[PDB]
Design a protein around this ligand. Sequence first.
Ligand SMILES: Nc1ncnc2c1ncn2[C@@H]1O[C@H](COP(=O)(O)OP(=O)(O)O)[C@@H](O)[C@H]1O
Ligand SMILES: [Mg+2]
Lengths: 54, 161, 47, 120, 156, 272
Amino acid sequence: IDMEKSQQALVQKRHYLFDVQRNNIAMALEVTYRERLHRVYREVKNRLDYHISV
Amino acid sequence: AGVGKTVLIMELINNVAKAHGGYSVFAGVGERTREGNDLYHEMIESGVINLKDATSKVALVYGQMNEPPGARARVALTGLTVAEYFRDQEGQDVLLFIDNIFRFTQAGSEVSALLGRIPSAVGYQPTLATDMGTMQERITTTKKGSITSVQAIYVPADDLT
Amino acid sequence: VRSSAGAVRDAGGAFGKREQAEEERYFRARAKEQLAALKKHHENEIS
Amino acid sequence: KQVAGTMKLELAQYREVAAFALDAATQQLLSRGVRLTELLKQGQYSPMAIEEQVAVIYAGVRGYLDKLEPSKITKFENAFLSHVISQHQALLGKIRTDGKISEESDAKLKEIVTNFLAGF
Amino acid sequence: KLALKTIDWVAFGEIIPRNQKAVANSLKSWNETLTSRLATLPEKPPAIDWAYYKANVAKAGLVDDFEKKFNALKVPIPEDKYTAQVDAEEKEDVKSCAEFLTQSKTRIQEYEKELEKMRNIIPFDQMTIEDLNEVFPETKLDKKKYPYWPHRPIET
Amino acid sequence: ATLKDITRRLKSIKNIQKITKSMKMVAAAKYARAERELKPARVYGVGSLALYEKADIKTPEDKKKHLIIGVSSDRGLCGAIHSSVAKQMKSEAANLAAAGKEVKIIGVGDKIRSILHRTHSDQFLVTFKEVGRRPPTFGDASVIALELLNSGYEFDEGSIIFNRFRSVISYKTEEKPIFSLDTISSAESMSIYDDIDADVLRNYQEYSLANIIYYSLKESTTSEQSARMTAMDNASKNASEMIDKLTLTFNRTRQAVITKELIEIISGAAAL
Ligand SMILES: Nc1ncnc2c1ncn2[C@@H]1O[C@H](COP(=O)(O)OP(=O)(O)O)[C@@H](O)[C@H]1O
Ligand SMILES: [Mg+2]
């Protein structure tokens, strides 16, 4: 009885794997966004620096 | 260096000097000025040096390692003179702590080559033994007084030879 | 040129550290045993 | 001052019995010494704030890492910081401002380390 | 923007079958790398001082045009197509709550039924061979293989 | 290095050489004594083995329980004695467990235990230490056999690995089978032997177990002392070569230091 009751009480919370996946994919999207913004900034700064330094 | 010379001599000042009726002299010869300030404040806290009354029991002479060799080679003689006076005229027991007495020799060695003397042994002045003797021979317990002299002696590179 | 007693640990090479450890482990063990015996004697002499 | 003192004693004891490599007590002493040693390593041009050093050294010296393998310690170290630096900024700010591991700060640190160790 | 739900890990380690730990550990590691990257990446892109950059360039017009094109043009963002794992959650709603939950509850019910049936029986001091025959069919000396006395094998 | 580094190293190596020479002499004396004692024990143990090679006994092929005993010692500095013994012990254990057996291990001497405490750490039925301090006797073999029989691991087969002492310079690692009465009774050859119930035979098996343990102990101690003598001789020779090289280096460094100080003095004198 105890084995079965604890098994049920435990498998109740199997949702953490999906919650992980959720926040992990959110993190992936955020890092992509950050890289996009930094890449555009770096390119514009590179061209400006080229002009200024020449 | 770093074995406990200064800590041991400070411990001796804490013990013998604190409970010693007679006077006391401390000659810092070519040692860190940080340590001189620390000792000044530690004595002020303990009470051997009293800045208010005239009950001080310690006389300090300092010629630290920022001084040119001429001053390091003679601050030992200055402290020794103060101790000698307290030994004779006062006719009483004295303690005399010196830290270190190797800086007297070393400071003597930093000017010898410029005074025209050929160096001896491991680049020491030819008059090492005589110069050290003419000083260490005034730190003595004559029949008129009594100097207990504690000396810290740096040993360059742990080399006792 | 001669040799003197207590020179293996004066060099401080590899034999010096090896000897130091061989000594320290043994006396740590013996200290543990003696401390256990001391506790036992304490308890047995409380009464 | 609180933490590095115990770390200093532990490394001092470890260095005596290090030249070789039995009983539980000295085996655990060597284990703790090695854990602390791999804790003290560091990279280049990445100095750590004093509170972060305190957190790492506390985790290492309170016998928590004694379960982990030593070759993995560095991992933990890095990971641990990247966790504490985001979720528990408040605790690090507390340690910095008050400048001591108070009893409540110690209890927190304890629960954070216990949780993180298992989850890793 | 960011307010990630907290995760317990000792709990996360309680719900992965042995056949699946090989992906659970990889998910843990890949979350770790993503977290480290996010911490490494700044809260904001650093500001710009367009005035100075335009004030040290002969063709101020060209850099002004760069600035204006920067002002007009933004950047794109990814979506949730890769997040199709949405569907997975619904499937779980069947096992842990419809199939596994219901079957487990039925097994539980059977287990209690057995429990009280076993707990409620007369003291042995009055019981009879028949009583053990019903309650415990394991004591029934099968006559389908051992007819003649003692039914229980002589070699035992 | 500098002159003081070389001086300290040279002194340390000289002390090490002295110690290794003394240890060679001690080991040689103990070896002479152990060989002298080994002769009678050699004949005694060979006689005790007599039966099993006179009435050939083939171990049963339907049993899984085996025992491995490995005789060595606590002392180190004996070269490849403990190493060879433990190597062959793990070879045999692997072969048995691959053929499908339930092997245990008894280690007479720490060094075997240590060599085998990483792998085979759970098969230790029991291990004995305090070996090698004094020459082994029949008391030691009786104690080992008694603590083997008492520890109720009724084995179905046995092997003992020791370093048979060939010559002062050479030794061999042996494996001597040890049988249980379950095998002696169930042997056609044993049908001939008269007045052979299963109780006198059991006492005989216990005594033969003690006998083989004693034989292995004597052979092992003889070979161990010989190996320690050889190892100390080689260590002293290596220390002598190192001392020669370091003395040459020390002379070079001493002369160089004299010349350096003298040139400093000369330069100072001429630079006034
Ligand atoms: N009694 C002592 N107990 C513990 N540590 C000491 C003691 N004396 C000296 N030390 C150590 O030595 C250092 C101070 O050495 P010090 O005596 O000032 O140098 P030196 O003797 O070369 O002048 C301290 O940092 C301390 O760690
Ligand atoms: Mg000092």
